[PDB]
Amino acid sequence: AQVINTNSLSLLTQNNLNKSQSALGTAIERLSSGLRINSAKDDAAGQAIANRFTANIKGLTQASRNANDGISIAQTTEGALNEINNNLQRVRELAVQSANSTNSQSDLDSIQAEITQRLNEIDRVSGQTQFNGVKVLAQDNTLTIQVGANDGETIDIDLKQINSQTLGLDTLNVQQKYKVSDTAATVTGYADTTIALDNSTFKASATGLGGTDQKIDGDLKFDDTTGKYYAKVTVTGGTGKDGYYEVSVDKTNGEVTLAGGATSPLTGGLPATATEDVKNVQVANADLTEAKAALTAAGVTGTASVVKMSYTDNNGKTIDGGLAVKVGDDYYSATQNKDGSISINTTKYTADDGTSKTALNKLGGADGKTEVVSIGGKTYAASKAEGHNFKAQPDLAEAAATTTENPLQKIDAALAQVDTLRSDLGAVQNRFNSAITNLGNTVNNLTSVRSRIEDSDYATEVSNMSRAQILQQAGTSVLAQANQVPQNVLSLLR
């Protein structure tokens, strides 16, 4: 009978329990990791969204970091700014101190110097304060910080350029003008030029001494008491012609010629005042050679003269100033060099509309004695203009021209500006926090959602599938016993 085979089928179902044992193993597999890529995720997209949820928090952890970057930049902005308030308020203090009419002009100059220091510090803070390189107060700019998982989900920080100029205190001045005056300064002594003393021309101007040959022995002796040059002269072939002679010097090319058609040596020899040994033409600095060339190149028309400045305050007290090169009504601060020559002060600066350049220091400003300088169509303080680049950093206020009207109002309006900017930033923080809380709340919630897809087994469900393990194992046990039953049942026939 085919029962052996038909039973084999009934055993194939028992062997199918071995496949159910493969299901026990498959269950053990489903319980092994809890989750398997065996397509329990089909609307993969929908199930992928769970992984996107975690990716959201990944973007949200970076978001929290961002947020904290923003928070820090918020904190930092106010930090660096606090100093600015700290500086300006102090200026206010000087503004009160200034309104005092008992103050002398020297007092006012002193107060102005500290105001200038405070304003300069404000400008440094504005230019250097940074966060990760962002110059938070150097320019108007809105920083967008991604604090959410998706595009455009950001919190914006509106940064403003806060400096002396934007605050309207770039020319805040409390100084008063001094009555400017001068007196001629006939600077003394001589200096040597580039003009080298050419002696070859002497012997032909000294033929009237005769002999065979007339030559100057050594260097010419100059006399800074008379401006006269003298020469030791050896007249080869002559009788009583050797001795000291006064020589005429060509102040242009340096030629040396016997002076005054002298027919015999000076009585008494070389004068006692002729002690300098010169190799070059001496110039009574008095011609202001370089100063005059600088004035011409500058476009200055008038005749120049060296004067000593004087400044008189409101109380009739006068102090002496330095040396100056007066031209017309203008005064150019000057310096007298080693050799007694004089040079107009210059400041040295970069660009304007490209390249290195130079301007001459005039005496002006809010007090009448501040070194100012004209670049382009402007007139800045020399202190500011020194080493400045108008290419890399153009746009600027000239030097203060007069005393500032209503300085306390202006300063108040300035601080008001600083303050409102700070409110936006700090309130930004709290907004960041408020935003962190929205996202944060949804974060705790999203994690509750990934738990459905992010699936796996432990108590409740483990017991369901574990009880099922033993339940099905009971089944495999049933067919383990029932695995031996058939083979024997089939062998009963005799």
Side-chain angles (χ1 to χ4, degrees):
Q2 37 113 308
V3 187
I4 18 178
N5 309 297
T6 200
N7 199 274
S8 175
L9 260 303
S10 234
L11 313 202
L12 194 55
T13 46
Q14 293 174 349
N15 282 332
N16 239 272
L17 220 298
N18 271 308
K19 298 179 187 179
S20 311
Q21 176 190 118
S22 182
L24 282 170
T26 232
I28 248 299
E29 186 75 301
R30 292 169 185 176
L31 286 135
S32 187
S33 190
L35 193 273
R36 252 294 121 195
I37 318 298
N38 222 111
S39 211
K41 268 61 167 298
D42 29 35
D43 327 326
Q47 295 261 321
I49 298 190
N51 299 292
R52 288 186 191 125
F53 282 129
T54 128
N56 298 302
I57 296 179
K58 289 171 177 171
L60 265 159
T61 37
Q62 299 171 29
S64 186
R65 295 173 188 172
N66 284 343
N68 279 325
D69 285 357
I71 289 183
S72 219
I73 300 174
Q75 293 192 147
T76 56
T77 279
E78 299 153 33
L81 269 172
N82 285 312
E83 265 300 302
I84 301 177
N85 213 285
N86 269 269
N87 295 303
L88 280 161
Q89 294 191 36
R90 159 45 148 203
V91 178
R92 273 175 172 185
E93 287 184 21
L94 301 182
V96 185
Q97 275 253 66
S98 101
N100 278 295
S101 279
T102 78
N103 285 310
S104 62
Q105 298 208 210
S106 65
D107 279 342
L108 292 184
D109 294 351
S110 189
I111 301 173
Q112 185 59 52
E114 145 48 4
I115 285 179
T116 291
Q117 294 281 273
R118 295 308 99 217
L119 294 183
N120 284 174
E121 174 58 1
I122 286 180
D123 287 347
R124 191 196 57 74
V125 167
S126 177
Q128 315 199 316
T129 303
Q130 57 71 62
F131 175 86
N132 201 14
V134 187
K135 301 303 168 289
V136 300
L137 287 152
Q139 59 151 25
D140 275 18
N141 159 43
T142 302
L143 252 58
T144 63
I145 316 287
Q146 177 88 15
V147 300
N150 315 292
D151 281 306
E153 301 187 7
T154 66
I155 291 180
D156 295 9
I157 306 175
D158 296 299
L159 299 169
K160 307 292 181 211
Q161 181 181 37
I162 291 297
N163 56 29
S164 288
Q165 192 279 120
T166 68
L167 289 174
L169 301 176
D170 52 324
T171 62
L172 171 63
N173 187 280
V174 299
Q175 289 180 297
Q176 284 170 351
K177 304 234 173 170
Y178 281 83
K179 181 177 178 170
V180 182
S181 69
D182 72 68
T183 47
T186 66
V187 188
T188 65
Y190 297 77
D192 56 305
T193 59
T194 301
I195 308 174
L197 293 179
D198 185 23
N199 289 220
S200 53
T201 54
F202 172 83
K203 92 153 299 187
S205 66
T207 34
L209 287 172
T212 310
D213 198 76
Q214 16 284 113
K215 71 228 144 299
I216 303 173
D217 311 330
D219 268 0
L220 265 48
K221 294 82 178 180
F222 180 74
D223 190 331
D224 65 12
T225 246
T226 55
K228 288 164 171 287
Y229 308 62
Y230 303 83
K232 189 200 166 224
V233 182
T234 286
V235 187
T236 306
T239 48
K241 299 305 169 182
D242 289 28
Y244 284 104
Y245 288 92
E246 179 187 327
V247 289
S248 276
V249 165
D250 185 285
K251 269 63 170 66
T252 293
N253 86 106
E255 292 184 303
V256 168
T257 51
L258 178 67
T263 59
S264 300
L266 288 174
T267 301
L270 190 80
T273 44
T275 60
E276 318 287 271
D277 281 84
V278 292
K279 269 197 176 57
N280 280 54
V281 168
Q282 296 311 288
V283 63
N285 302 304
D287 301 335
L288 311 180
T289 318
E290 285 169 6
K292 290 194 176 187
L295 288 178
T296 307
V300 186
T301 302
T303 324
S305 59
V306 185
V307 297
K308 192 260 288 177
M309 304 299 320
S310 303
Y311 306 101
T312 299
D313 64 6
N314 306 334
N315 302 130
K317 172 180 178 174
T318 100
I319 59 161
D320 299 324
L323 280 167
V325 174
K326 190 173 183 180
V327 193
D329 285 301
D330 293 3
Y331 296 96
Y332 301 85
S333 47
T335 298
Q336 175 200 304
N337 313 130
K338 23 48 155 283
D339 54 353
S341 63
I342 110 160
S343 33
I344 300 191
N345 294 357
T346 67
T347 43
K348 218 72 73 282
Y349 71 95
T350 339
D352 179 60
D353 284 278
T355 83
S356 179
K357 289 149 189 176
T358 273
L360 305 181
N361 296 3
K362 187 188 306 304
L363 293 175
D367 58 7
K369 60 164 180 58
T370 298
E371 285 182 309
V372 290
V373 101
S374 192
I375 305 175
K378 296 187 180 62
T379 139
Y380 315 84
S383 54
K384 298 289 174 296
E386 235 284 45
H388 194 274
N389 198 326
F390 304 78
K391 161 203 280 73
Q393 299 176 287
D395 52 78
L396 172 52
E398 297 184 13
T402 45
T403 314
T404 302
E405 303 175 85
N406 306 106
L408 291 178
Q409 247 79 81
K410 294 180 177 172
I411 309 172
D412 269 61
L415 273 191
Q417 296 171 38
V418 185
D419 249 77
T420 170
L421 304 180
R422 302 178 181 182
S423 54
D424 252 14
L425 308 162
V428 178
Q429 297 161 353
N430 298 327
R431 307 184 172 112
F432 270 115
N433 297 335
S434 213
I436 288 171
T437 250
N438 254 286
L439 297 158
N441 268 262
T442 50
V443 174
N444 276 298
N445 298 315
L446 293 184
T447 95
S448 154
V449 184
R450 53 104 203 201
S451 143
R452 295 167 218 149
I453 287 173
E454 52 94 279
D455 92 39
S456 36
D457 281 25
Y458 113 124
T460 319
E461 287 178 23
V462 91
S463 201
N464 292 332
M465 296 304 272
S466 194
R467 148 259 294 167
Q469 281 175 59
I470 295 184
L471 207 167
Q472 293 176 67
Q473 270 185 72
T476 206
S477 185
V478 170
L479 294 200
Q481 301 177 57
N483 131 269
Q484 291 171 61
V485 177
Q487 292 187 37
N488 284 310
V489 167
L490 304 179
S491 191
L492 49 37
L493 44 139
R494 301 168 186 86

